[PDB]
């Protein structure tokens, strides 16, 4: 009953960085993006998303 209970536990991944604060919940429960390798005229940005309460903002 333990081992079959364990089979949900984590699921299959992870991430989280816990660096940027979220102004909607003070907790730094945030995720970060590495994208825009080249793109156009828009500068390559680091995008940060807060898992809880759904917040996303940019390095810029």
Partner 1 sequence: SNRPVMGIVQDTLTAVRKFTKRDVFLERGEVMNLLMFLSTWDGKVPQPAILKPRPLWTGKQIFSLIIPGHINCIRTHSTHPDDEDSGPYKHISPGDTKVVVENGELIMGILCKKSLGTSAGSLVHISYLEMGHDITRLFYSNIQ
Read out DSSP for the chain? -HHHHHTTSS-S-------S--TTTSS--EEEEE--SS-SSSPP-EEEEETTTTEEEE--
Q: Is 22 annotated as a binding residue?
A: yes
Which partner from the list partner 1, Zn ion, none does 43 bind, CB cut-off 5 to 8 Å by kind?
partner 1
Binding site for Zn ion (CB under 5 A): 22, 24-25, 50, 52-53, 55
Q: Which residues, 21 to 60, sit near partner 1 by CB under 8 A?
A: 21, 23, 41-43, 58-60
Interface with partner 1 (CB under 8 A)? 20-21, 23, 41-43, 58-60
């Amino acid at each position: 009953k333990e081992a079959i209970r364990e089979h949900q536990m984590a699921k299959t991944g992870g991430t989280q960085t816990d660096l940027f604060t979220c102004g909607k919940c003070k907790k730094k429960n945030c995720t970060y993006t590495q994208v825009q390798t080249r793109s156009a005229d828009e500068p390559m940005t680091t995008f940060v998303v807060c898992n809880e309460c759904g917040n996303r903002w940019k390095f810029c």
